[PDB]
Amino acid sequence: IVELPTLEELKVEEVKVSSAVLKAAAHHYGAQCDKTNKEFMLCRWEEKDPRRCLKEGKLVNGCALNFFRQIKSHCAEPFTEYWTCLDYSNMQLFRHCRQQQAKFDQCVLDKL
Amino acid sequence: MNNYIFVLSSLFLVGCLGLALKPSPIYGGLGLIVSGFVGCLMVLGFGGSFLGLMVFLIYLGGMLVVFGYTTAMATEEYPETWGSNWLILGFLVLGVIMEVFLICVLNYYDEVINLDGLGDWLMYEVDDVGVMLEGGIGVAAMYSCATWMMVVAGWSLFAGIFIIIEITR
Amino acid sequence: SAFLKNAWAKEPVLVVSFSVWGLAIIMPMISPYTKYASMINKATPYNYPVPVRDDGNMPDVPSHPQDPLGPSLDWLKNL
Amino acid sequence: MNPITLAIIYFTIFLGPVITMSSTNLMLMWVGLEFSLLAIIPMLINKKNPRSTEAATKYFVTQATASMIILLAIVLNYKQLGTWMFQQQTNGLILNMTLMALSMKLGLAPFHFWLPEVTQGIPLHMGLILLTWQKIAPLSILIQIYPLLNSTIILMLAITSIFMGAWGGLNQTQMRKIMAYSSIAHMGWMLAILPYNPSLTLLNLMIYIILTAPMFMALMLNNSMTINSISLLWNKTPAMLTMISLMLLSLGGLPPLTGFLPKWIIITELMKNNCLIMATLMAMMALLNLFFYTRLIYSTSLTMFPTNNNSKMMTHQTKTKPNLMFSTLAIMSTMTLPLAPQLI
Amino acid sequence: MFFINILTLLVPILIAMAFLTLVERKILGYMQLRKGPNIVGPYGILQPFADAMKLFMKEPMRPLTTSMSLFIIAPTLSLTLALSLWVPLPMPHPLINLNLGILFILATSSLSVYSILWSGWASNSKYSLFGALRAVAQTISYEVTMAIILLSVLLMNGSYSLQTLITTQEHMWLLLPAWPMAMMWFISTLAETNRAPFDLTEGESELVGFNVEYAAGPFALFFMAEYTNIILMNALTTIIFLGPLYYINLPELYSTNFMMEALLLSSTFLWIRASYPRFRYDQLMHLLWKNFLPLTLALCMWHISLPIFTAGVPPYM
Amino acid sequence: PFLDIQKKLGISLDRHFMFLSAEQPYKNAARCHAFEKEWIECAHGIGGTRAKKECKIEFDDFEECLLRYKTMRRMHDIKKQREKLMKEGKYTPPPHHSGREEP
Amino acid sequence: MNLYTVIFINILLSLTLILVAFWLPQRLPFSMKFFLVAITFLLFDLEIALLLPLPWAIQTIKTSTMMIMAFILVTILSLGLAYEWTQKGLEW
Amino acid sequence: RMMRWNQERRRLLIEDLEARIALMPLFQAEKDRRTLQILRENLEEEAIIMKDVPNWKVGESVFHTTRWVPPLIGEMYGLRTKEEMSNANFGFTWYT
Amino acid sequence: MPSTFFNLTMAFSLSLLGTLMFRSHLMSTLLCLEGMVLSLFIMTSVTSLNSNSMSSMPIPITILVFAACEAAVGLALLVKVSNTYGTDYVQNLNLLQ
Amino acid sequence: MWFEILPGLAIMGVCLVIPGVSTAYIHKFTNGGKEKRVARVQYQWYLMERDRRISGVNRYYVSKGLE
């Protein structure tokens, strides 16, 4: 057989936010949540079987989710302005938006 | 759409059928150009842009232009033989239809065609989240990773000039 | 030299042509930046950097990206 | 030829076989074959006589389609095994293609029609290269892949070549074509033992090279493309009459001379492998080859054909000498037999 | 909507094609002390439409000795490739942005040489064949330097996509750097559109070759093709070397300046035509293989070196 | 090969890129890289004559990663039944075919 | 597809014109020079190919080898040209 | 100017590649999770249709190795929505 | 590719049948000969592309570069023939009998 | 006087700006006011596709922190 895991086993919450939103906060997500991210990744690489590292993966989404909940709590408005401007650009280039970026980045260095 | 590649592949075969029936040299050349484009689109269908477009640059306008060129000064006029060009046209059309039923026959032998599995195999695997996985990154190994592939070709071109001039002389 | 001169004034393309051929064959050899190209392009991170297990026997590898350990591109910055 | 061009071409005609031999990536073996094809064509038309253009245009088409078939085999393998090189697993049809194709470039058996004709329209010199430094390349590719090729086909191409070569030679009177035909024959023996003991192919080749290279530099010393022309050898240069006699009988398998060893050990190896059917028929028609060799012997040495008064004039003038290679390759060839054990 | 866009690119371009002809017949005029066509319509605006209708109505003539396909395929191919090459052009946004965009433009141009070859063989008269052979040669030769000149550009742009140059030229035109090639791109653009200084493809005093046997509708289609090309190649000069200012907030000032630079460089080849006598057939190839190809190949190497030792290797993507 | 001027000279102009598991540019692993390795570290030190019988598990698998024909077959077989079953009205594609979409 | 849509409109527009155009109205020229050019052209056209990947190869980590390779290719072809000039070739 | 501009651009090239580098782990967890779902979902339907099949286990690796094997895009969507299949096959090439 | 690599392969065989049976003009062979190189180039590129084997893409092009010169030589022989016999017709090539 | 050549040039120009303004607003209409995403490399197509799945069927619709 194939021992493919069951759906209930793989039904976990995810960010489910527009690519831009992730991108806008990516730099800080790479910061606040790599401890677990890496782990999931190290699990992923050395144990080629994803099925084996699925758990770590549920932890991944989760860590990020709160990462977002904390953003939601503070400097949220800034982030909202930064992503909206970032999304308008076709390649969502970071340099078109630097004034909006400075606010949110500054704020998260005051509040978070 | 899922047959997009089968069709293109089919037309290619016909194109080659034409060249084979040896129609008048220049019309045959037209044939190789038609097959050429069809082919380019095939490679451009499996995900390779550089390899395909290069087919166009070096071979569609680049190489056969020459063929047509030389087929302009030395291959005479295919004179007094033009009539067959019509007969050849027919056999071609007939052959095409023949193959039409032919593959239907091969399809029958399930024991490949994957009539149902069409469009499920043009591509097999992709680095969904990858960045530098574009046909070409490879073609460039020729400068660094693989250079032998360049030193050999380079010699060919270089020697080619000396050779062609010597044969032509 | 004299021909060189007339060559500069007659058939003054080849002269320029060759000159460039050479200047491109020299500048790379002698330049304060040539080395950077292989670095700047080396650094550009395209493929995910897979993390190694912590046997705990490695003081060189930074345990966290922002740690004071590891490679830096400040050379790229302020370049 | 602008001496520069001569160098580029000659380098290619020499880089051509060498890349083939050295590389393992078949592709690189194919381009080695491709470079040989491109380099040889300029030299073939050096006189640019009407016969020559015909020669090259045939050699090129025969060589080109075979080259394309060899590439198709490599392309097919690439999809049956990701490797760019033949392996145990290779589909049998994939290898057979390579045999046919490579047997066309080498010109063996039912593809033996191009060689006699190109050997007829090219100079004696370029004849040698076209016969012996252009066989090394394809054979290398075969010898490398021997474990995998079919014993049946090779044998059929082997036997056919022996017959075609022999029969063709009997009628021919043009020397260039007599040699072309002999080469087809010897090439046959070589490919017969490839599946069983490749190391002997490399002996049946060297000996063929050490036999044919002296034989051709002999034909050109007096530049005679006719037997009638070589028959007046006794007047033009008498000494080469003795060795021309032994080298030609050596090319055929007669026992005291070096030429017996290749046939003898190939027969010993085939009987060791039990082909006592095949080996017997080959040896028998091999005897037909000596008949046309001895018919030439008759005209050139054992009997003195009438010559022309104008020949006395050519005697007067000092005869430009034959290179040293002739001697060293005539003796090492006519009589090394006492040293066979170490050769094999 | 996509079709709407298809229409927005082709219809306007075709109309622009038409009026280029008028503009060519007035700017050449005033340079030669003559008003040019102003009597039909107001200031000659209806003049391009008028001969279009005359050309299509006049009987298309199929020479007794003429192929009937290599004859009708040739103008269709010429118009199809030229109008097609406007598909992937940054203005600033391209209709169909292609990752290997410049290779598309180079390949599509190359295919037009056939139309000349096919039309020349199809006519079956001596003037046509002689003209086509020299013509194909001119076009092909001016392709070898044309391509190398682009490869030098790309290596300083980082990619084959024409869209990248809008980001490469956000601070300075690529004329400042690489001006030596602009000139050589401009002269090659003059050859590939068989315009004047290099109009031997169809010399009039010499072989009155391309359209000798082509009248009415076939004449028009190539005809249209040439002029659309005249614009397209000029437009490629106005993206690759003269980079119009781009502001992401308002995309039309890019197109407004693209409009201005394209018209001026399109005006320039009109001005070149009236100003210069036509070069000899060999004088034309003498330029490319002797004067330009050594300059281009060497400056090509300088553009593989400028990046490396100036640590400026361009960012892919 | 016939004349190993490469090993002798130590150069490797032709060996670095002969199999799918060789170094791919930017380390973009090929497909079937999970197997070819397993099928050539197996046949290393064991000559071919014995890389052809006992190391048949790894080629039978690598002959299926690449060709991927047994899959094609199984799949094709599945469809057929689905076609026949769909004929009887037995099989009705679930809305799962058109469900939510996981991030 | 988007390209296919555009292109077929492109052919349609041209076929429409020619059709209306035809419906509304109701032996030994040879010079080796020419052949020689065509040949040279491809030798150069092939080289263009071996030079086309240079934009991707710029980003190659090696760099030194890249340039060393590219410079050798351009130089050896140019020498081919050089000999073309030296010989009667390119002298029509 | 070109030297300075591309150096600026290269730094930017580094700034956003690392941005995905950070976002990738999440995508990996997501992709796998979803990938398996597609395989499993196909298992459900597989069993439904292969049950009647005579002595044919619902699913079996054509390859005897127990290593985890990525499924071909063809396997994942072949029996799924044909449109879905097409999107995966020629979707990116046609882009958007 | 399972049946898309059979069309290309048969294309090469249909091109094979072509080069092997001559008829009049030699150009048609050469031209045909080239039809194979295109089919080989397309097949090599196709499998390399669906094997994601980027290390091998060099080959699809090396094949074309060598094939182009190969053809250059072929055409120079062709021009040489219709300079000696005024035609490319093969029958003329029967002196070596 | 030369100014008469202007009428013709104007018509050409107007007909060369239309295309650039047209293509660049039939994009910002079809894509929901946001520039059509340029998916040069797969990652981008993935992110784009991911967006589609995230909401409605169209990627241009973009969910935010409030989801």
Curated annotation (Swiss-Prot), chain C:
Residue numbers spanned by region Disordered: 54-79
Q: Does the keyword Membrane apply?
A: yes
Disulfide linkage: none
- What processes does the entry annotate via GO biological process terms? aerobic respiration; proton motive force-driven mitochondrial ATP synthesis
Specify the superkingdom. Answer: Eukaryota
Enumerate the subcellular locations listed in this protein's record, separating them with semicolons: Mitochondrion inner membrane
TM regions (residue ranges):
14-34
User: Sorted alphabetically, which InterPro entries does this protein's record hold?
Assistant: NDUFA3
Taken from the record, one Pfam family name reads NADHdh_A3
Instruction: State the CDD domains in the record.
Output: NDUFA3
| Keyword entries, A-Z | Acetylation, Electron transport, Membrane, Mitochondrion, Mitochondrion inner membrane, Respiratory chain, Transmembrane, Transmembrane helix, Transport
Q: Would the keyword Cell inner membrane turn up in this protein's UniProt record?
A: no
Question: Which membrane topology describes this protein?
Answer: Single-pass membrane protein
Any one GO cellular component localisation term in the record: mitochondrial inner membrane
Relate the assembly described in the record: Complex I is composed of 45 different subunits.
Q: To which protein family does this belong?
A: Belongs to the complex I NDUFA3 subunit family.
Function according to Swiss-Prot or TrEMBL: Accessory subunit of the mitochondrial membrane respiratory chain NADH dehydrogenase (Complex I), that is believed not to be involved in catalysis. Complex I functions in the transfer of electrons from NADH to the respiratory chain. The immediate electron acceptor for the enzyme is believed to be ubiquinone.
| Name listed for the protein in its UniProt record | NADH dehydrogenase [ubiquinone] 1 alpha subcomplex subunit 3
Q: Which organism is it from?
A: Mus musculus
UniProtKB/Swiss-Prot annotation, chain F:
Record's subcellular location: Mitochondrion inner membrane; Mitochondrion intermembrane space
Q: Give membrane topology per the record.
A: Peripheral membrane protein
Q: Where is this motif: Cx9C motif 1?
A: 32-42
Limits of the CHCH domain: 29-73
* Motif Cx9C motif 2 boundaries: 55-65
What Pfam families does its record include? Ndufs5 (PF10200)
- What this protein is called in its record is NADH dehydrogenase [ubiquinone] iron-sulfur protein 5
Source organism of this protein record: Mus musculus (Mouse)
* Gene for this chain: Ndufs5
UniProtKB/Swiss-Prot annotation, chain G:
Where can this protein be found?
Answer: Mitochondrion inner membrane
GO terms for biological process, alphabetical: aerobic respiration; cellular response to glucocorticoid stimulus; mitochondrial electron transport, NADH to ubiquinone; proton motive force-driven mitochondrial ATP synthesis; response to light intensity; response to oxidative stress
One GO MF annotation is:
NADH dehydrogenase (ubiquinone) activity
Task: Return any one Pfam family short name.
Answer: Oxidored_q4
Reaction equation(s) it catalyzes:
a ubiquinone + NADH + 5 H(+)(in) = a ubiquinol + NAD(+) + 4 H(+)(out)
Gene3D superfamilies in the cross-refs: NADH:ubiquinone/plastoquinone oxidoreductase, chain 3
Give the signal sequence positions: none
Instruction: List the keywords (alphabetical).
Output: Electron transport, Membrane, Mitochondrion, Mitochondrion inner membrane, NAD, Respiratory chain, Translocase, Transmembrane, Transmembrane helix, Transport, Ubiquinone
The portions of this protein that span the membrane are 3-23, 34-54, 65-85
Q: Which GO terms describe its cellular component?
A: mitochondrial inner membrane; mitochondrion; respiratory chain complex I
Organism superkingdom? Eukaryota
Its principal location? mitochondrion
EC number of the protein: 7.1.1.2
Annotated InterPro entries: NADH_UbQ/plastoQ_OxRdtase_su3 (IPR000440), NDAH_ubi_oxred_su3_sf (IPR038430)
Membrane topology, as annotated, equals: Multi-pass membrane protein
Spell out the family assignment given in the record's similarity comment.
Belongs to the complex I subunit 3 family.
Describe the task this protein carries out.
Core subunit of the mitochondrial membrane respiratory chain NADH dehydrogenase (Complex I) which catalyzes electron transfer from NADH through the respiratory chain, using ubiquinone as an electron acceptor. Essential for the catalytic activity of complex I.
* Record protein name field: NADH-ubiquinone oxidoreductase chain 3
Species of origin: Mus musculus
Q: What is the lineage of its organism?
A: Eukaryota, Metazoa, Chordata, Craniata, Vertebrata
The coding gene here is: mt-Nd3
Swiss-Prot record, chain H:
Superkingdom assignment: Eukaryota
Q: Which UniProt keywords apply?
A: Acetylation, Apoptosis, Electron transport, Membrane, Mitochondrion, Mitochondrion inner membrane, Nucleus, Respiratory chain, Transmembrane, Transmembrane helix, Transport
Topology relative to the membrane, per the entry?
Single-pass membrane protein
List localization entries.
Answer: Mitochondrion inner membrane; Nucleus
For this record, an example GO cellular component is:
nucleus
**Is Transport given among the entry's keywords?**
yes
Q: Which GO terms describe its molecular function?
A: ATP binding
| Location, primary (coarse class) | mitochondrion
| Biological process annotations from GO | aerobic respiration; cellular response to interferon-beta; cellular response to retinoic acid; extrinsic apoptotic signaling pathway; mitochondrial respiratory chain complex I assembly; negative regulation of DNA-templated transcription; positive regulation of execution phase of apoptosis; positive regulation of protein catabolic process
The answer, when asked if NAD is one of the entry's keywords, is: no
Report the family membership. Belongs to the complex I NDUFA13 subunit family.
Q: Describe the task this protein carries out.
A: Accessory subunit of the mitochondrial membrane respiratory chain NADH dehydrogenase (Complex I), that is believed not to be involved in catalysis. Complex I functions in the transfer of electrons from NADH to the respiratory chain. The immediate electron acceptor for the enzyme is believed to be ubiquinone. Involved in the interferon/all-trans-retinoic acid (IFN/RA) induced cell death. This apoptotic activity is inhibited by interaction with viral IRF1. Prevents the transactivation of STAT3 target genes.
What name does this protein carry?
NADH dehydrogenase [ubiquinone] 1 alpha subcomplex subunit 13
